[PDB]
Write a protein that binds this ligand. Structure first.
Ligand SMILES: C[C@H]1O[C@H](O[C@H]2[C@H](O)[C@@H](O)[C@@H](O[C@H]3[C@H](O)[C@@H](O)[C@H](O)O[C@@H]3CO)O[C@@H]2CO)[C@H](O)[C@@H](O)[C@@H]1N[C@H]1C=C(CO)[C@@H](O)[C@H](O)[C@H]1O
Ligand SMILES: [Ca+2]
Length: 832
């Protein structure tokens, strides 16, 4: 038998003629048989270009084999001379005899080869195979059960991808496991390939990564200054909280923060979270990072809505700090707060999209939403945009026991080129920002006046409460009164504001007041003059009413002491702590800080080198200082997934490549980053990097992994009554770039030498220390909890009829012996 069906065997038994992922074969995959035939008699050898889809030759069961035959005969491949018509195959099924189905399938092969020769290509065949796959539940992508995630699990078939660790949802107070707080503590999975931050080797790699960022410019040989001072921690509610302990440990080891509030405050770190249980967690740990406060939502519900506003009293209570009469130090949870951030603006725009492209797929256009938003922002009767933006900032910037965070997109038109266009709110917000540096310090009292209308008073540096004498020389000339109403039809009336007994018989300047059309900064259109003077007890009598304009819907008024010139009420941090077990303490020295978010998701790509965000912030370094900003939050500077929607930094490909001249990020190059940070340092600011330990989206390398269908907590779940566990999945899991290759684990030896305690301190979740003996030069499933569903499908893995997976040895892959289906391998099969 020199010519025959034995030529269905693979040309060679290796990767050169058989598609495989880690040795495992796919039903969507292709192979090169030795030869092919269009009639059964004449057989021709393949060249290197003549490959065929495996679904012509092998199937997961007799049922699918019969449905393959039936489908192909019904969709173009009918031929009565080879026993293949719509009624000859109509009654085939899984119960049909095996040799009969094999014979019918062999005849179809000949008819397919006739089709191939008629078309001079396999293009139509490839399309028919893909179309057939979608009609089988088990072969299509829909087998993975949208929408959600899968967890990677242990299996001897995917032994390389095994793990002892994968401790899922060890988040916030659930570090130990054991959720007995009846409170929202967050969950492991968000979106993309979830990094196992429970793995000791990964925990060591995070410390490496953090050390790299903290010494960036030095280690790259760029600007020798220009290294990051701290961290904004992304997705802190969705990572094993061990890494929060270990970040704090590293920073304390490097910079000696436990002793000195000065050292702590110069290396400010803060955790992104939308769950109040994080406050408790951080307090128990001595506050290694700042807790993200929820006063933004309160500000939006009370001042920002069009109609159905919450009562003005919500501003005193609706926060991690009660500010009805806040006259103490070191008691409040050290926190950071915001009027807006990049996600808040995004959720506004991404719901305006739902009206413009109604229920449709977004991925395509919608700058029309922004044109609508910009127009709406200028209107009195706003459809979509936030009301009372300046008043929201006035409250945020005058609040005690917090580090306020200003949003780039509230100072600038965020979809324009970087810092090219100022927002309508630039004047109001920057006026309040400079006034903060000059005036706000001391105890806070928020007094309700008429169900709408609240006076928020700060008593000045060294003035603890309303009855105190001043201790500081600036006590007399410091403090602020912020008047905020949220009823645009409020009756015109007079009000009495207690400035404190330290401010008796004192002249106060009208810093900001409301007019018919907007705001005034020299009392021009207002109900009050340029200056008012307190009575003998320090009460200020002021006139107020409802207004309706683009800036104010209700009332906004701000009063500060009359001063001889330049003033600065920033309190310098102590060089010895009050507690010593605490890292951060909510006091006047922390309250003197102020964060600036430098980016938006809707920031454009730069049209020139001069429009690179890093170059623009190098140019404007002194402006940020002049505005009273001392803590610069920079966007994630990492290399991005090319097809990510916003190009923002969160969809990470390479943790260590922050951009080159040839291949910059959205924000610029690494050398530009180093210069930018040095420029900010020269202006007197500290700067922190957005660090993203939760996920890496868009790794290019595929890996054969064993997976189980899970909810966002990483526990197995059911979807419309269906589930699966221990299924083979050909997921995109492997990569990291040349940055990970060259810098991954590079500084673990140095860290071990300098700070041995990093790798002997046992983590709470695991009970073992970070492991510096393995370097992560490349990411793979072994260091991953799982992934969001990748639209590939679960039932493509080729199992043989005996039950075992089909495997192909190939130099890298030596887990098992080579065992392939008889149809494309066994000479002994074809001998019969
Ligand atoms: C995008 C953001 O998603 C997650 O935060 C979610 C909360 O999980 C979710 O509960 C909701 O928060 C509200 C909460 O439900 C409610 O109790 C309270 O009254 O109000 C909350 C705010 O309105 O919505 C937020 C987001 O809108 C994660 O916790 C965040 O880490 C995540 N942001 C990060 C992470 C990624 C990568 O996944 C980036 O896409 C994003 O830009 C970055 O900021
Ligand atoms: Ca996670």
């Amino acid at each position: 038998v020199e010519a025959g069906p034995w030529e269905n065997m693979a040309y060679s038994m290796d990767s050169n003629s058989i598609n495989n992922i880690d040795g495992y074969i796919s039903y969507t995959g292709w192979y090169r048989p030795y030869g092919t035939s269009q009639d059964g008699k004449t057989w021709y050898p393949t060249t290197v270009a003549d490959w065929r889809p495996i679904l012509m030759y092998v199937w997961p069961s007799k049922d699918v084999q019969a449905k393959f035959i039936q489908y192909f005969v019904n969709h173009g491949y009918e031929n009565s001379n080879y026993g293949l018509t719509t009624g000859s195959v109509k009654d085939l099924s899984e119960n049909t005899a095996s040799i009969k189905l094999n014979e019918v399938a062999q005849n179809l092969r000949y008819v397919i080869e006739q089709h191939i020769v008629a078309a001079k290509s396999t293009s139509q065949l490839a399309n028919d195979i893909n179309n057939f796959i979608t009609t089988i539940p088990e072969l299509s992508a829909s087998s993975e059960l949208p929408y959600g995630q899968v967890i990677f699990v242990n299996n001897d078939n995917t032994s390389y991808a095994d793990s002892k660790y994968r401790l899922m949802s060890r988040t916030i107070n659930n570090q130990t496991g054991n959720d007995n707080d009846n409170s929202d503590n967050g969950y492991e999975f968000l979106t993309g390939i979830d990094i196992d931050n429970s793995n000791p080797v990964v925990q060591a790699e995070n410390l490496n990564w953090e050390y790299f960022l903290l010494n960036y410019g030095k280690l790259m040989g760029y600007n020798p200054d220009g290294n990051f001072d701290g961290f904004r921690i992304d997705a802190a509610d969705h990572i094993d909280a061990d890494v929060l302990d270990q970040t704090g440990q590293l920073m304390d080891d490097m910079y000696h923060m436990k002793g000195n509030p000065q050292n702590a405050n110069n290396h400010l770190s803060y955790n992104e979270g939308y769950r109040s249980s994080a406050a408790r967690m951080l307090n128990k740990k001595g506050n290694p990072q700042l807790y993200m406060d929820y006063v933004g939502s309160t500000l939006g519900n009370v001042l920002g809505r069009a109609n159905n506003r919450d009562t003005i009293s919500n501003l005193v209570t609706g926060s991690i700090v009660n500010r009805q009469n806040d006259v103490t130090e070191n008691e409040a949870t050290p926190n950071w707060s915001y009027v807006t951030n990049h996600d808040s603006r995004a959720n506004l725009i991404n719901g305006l999209i739902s009206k413009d492209h109604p229920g449709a797929y977004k991925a395509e256009y919608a700058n029309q939403a922004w044109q609508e938003f910009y127009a709406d922002q200028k209107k009195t009767d706003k459809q979509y945009a936030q009301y009372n933006v300046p008043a929201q900032y006035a409250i945020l910037l005058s609040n005690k026991d917090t580090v306020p965070q200003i949003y780039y997109g509230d100072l600038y038109n965020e979809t324009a080129q970087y810092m090219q266009e100022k927002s309508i709110y630039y004047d109001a917000i920057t006026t309040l920002m400079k006034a903060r540096k000059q005036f706000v310090s001391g105890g806070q009292t928020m007094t309700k006046l008429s169900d709408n209308l609240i006076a928020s008073v700060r008593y000045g540096k060294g003035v603890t409460n309303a009855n105190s004498e001043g201790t500081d020389s600036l006590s007399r000339t410091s403090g602020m009164a912020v008047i905020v109403g949220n009823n645009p039809q409020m009756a015109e009336q007079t009000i009495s504001i207690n400035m404190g007994r330290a401010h008796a018989n004192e002249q106060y300047r009208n810093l900001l007041d409301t007019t018919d059309n907007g705001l005034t900064y020299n009392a021009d259109g207002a109900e009050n003059p340029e200056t008012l003077t307190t009575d003998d007890n320090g009460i200020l009598k002021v006139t107020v009413k409802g207004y309706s304009n683009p800036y104010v819907s209700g009332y906004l008024g701000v009063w500060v002491p009359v001063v001889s010139g330049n003033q600065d009420v920033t309190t310098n941090a102590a060089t010895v702590s009050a507690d010593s077990n605490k890292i951060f303490e909510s006091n006047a020295a922390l309250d003197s800080h102020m964060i600036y978010q430098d980016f938006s998701l809707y920031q454009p790509e730069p049209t020139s080198t001069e429009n690179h965000a890093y170059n623009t912030i190098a140019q404007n370094a002194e402006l940020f200082n002049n505005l009273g900003i001392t803590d610069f939050w920079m966007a994630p500077p990492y290399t991005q997934y090319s097809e990510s929607r916003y190009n923002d930094g969160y969809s990470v490909t390479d943790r260590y490549n922050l951009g080159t001249n040839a291949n910059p990020t959205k924000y610029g190059s690494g050398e530009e980053l180093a210069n930018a940070i040095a420029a900010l340092h020269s202006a007197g600011l500290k700067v922190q990097v957005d660090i993203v330990m939760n996920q890496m989206i868009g790794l290019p390398g595929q890996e054969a992994v064993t997976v189980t269908r899970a909810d966002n907590r990483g526990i197995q779940t059911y979807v419309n009554g269906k589930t699966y566990a221990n299924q083979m999945y050909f997921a995109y899991t492997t990569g990291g770039g040349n940055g990970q290759e060259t810098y991954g684990g590079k500084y673990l030896s140095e860290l071990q030498s300098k700070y041995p305690d990093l790798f002997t301190t046992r983590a709470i979740s695991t009970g073992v220390a970070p492991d510096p003996t393995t370097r992560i030069t490349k990411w793979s499933a072994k260091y991953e909890n799982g992934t969001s569903l990748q639209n590939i499908g679960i039932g493509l893995a080729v199992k043989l009829p005996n039950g075992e997976y089909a495997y192909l040895r190939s130099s890298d892959n030596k887990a098992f012996n080579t065992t392939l289906p008889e149809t494309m391998s066994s000479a002994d099969y074809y001998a019969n």
